[PDB]
Amino acid sequence: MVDAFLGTWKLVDSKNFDDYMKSLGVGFATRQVASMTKPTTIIEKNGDILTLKTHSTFKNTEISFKLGVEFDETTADDRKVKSIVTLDGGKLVHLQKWDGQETTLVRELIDGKLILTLTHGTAVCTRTYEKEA
Ligand SMILES: CCCCCCCCCCCCC(=O)O
């Protein structure tokens, strides 16, 4: 049941995103721009296939996947990873693997807001998105 995640979402709060980016090795100038960017995330489904778009003034990404089926992904910061997205506890959990490393991108709904928790190494970032009409 992915349906309450679907729609267009705008970033309205960010905590520790610089720590997360730095853990991934993102360079200072990119982190600087990213710290001032408010992406729009669009999540849509067509049958079993989800498409997740991230749009900003800096950098755009798009992925399509089936829940529970691995896919190749090239992230915004140009990591080539093996990914899987699943529902776990009502949360949409995206796991990326590369070079023996892992990062998780966990989405959940709290009071109608989309909370994205990003973990890599010891870095834990929390970003909050609110839905666009
Ligand atoms: C080139 C710009 C790279 C910026 C850092 C990207 C890190 C991985 C993706 C983070 C996604 C955050 C979000 O969807 O709010």
UniProtKB/Swiss-Prot annotation:
Binding residues annotated for octadecanoate, in chain numbering: R127, T128, Y129
Report if keyword Metal-binding is assigned.
no
Give the sites modified to Phosphotyrosine. Answer: Y20
In terms of InterPro entries, this protein maps to: Calycin (IPR012674), Fatty_acid-bd (IPR000463), ILBP (IPR031259), Lipocln_cytosolic_FA-bd_dom (IPR000566)
Q: What is its main location?
A: cytoplasm
Question: Where are the N-acetylvaline residues found in this chain?
Answer: V2
Keywords for this entry?
Acetylation, Cytoplasm, Lipid-binding, Phosphoprotein, Transport
Cellular component terms, GO, for this chain's entry? cytosol; extracellular exosome; extracellular space; nucleus; sarcoplasm
- Modified sites of kind Phosphoserine: S23, S83
- Function summary: FABPs are thought to play a role in the intracellular transport of long-chain fatty acids and their acyl-CoA esters.
The family note in this entry says:
Belongs to the calycin superfamily. Fatty-acid binding protein (FABP) family.
Protein name (database record): Fatty acid-binding protein, heart
What is the species of this protein?
Answer: Homo sapiens
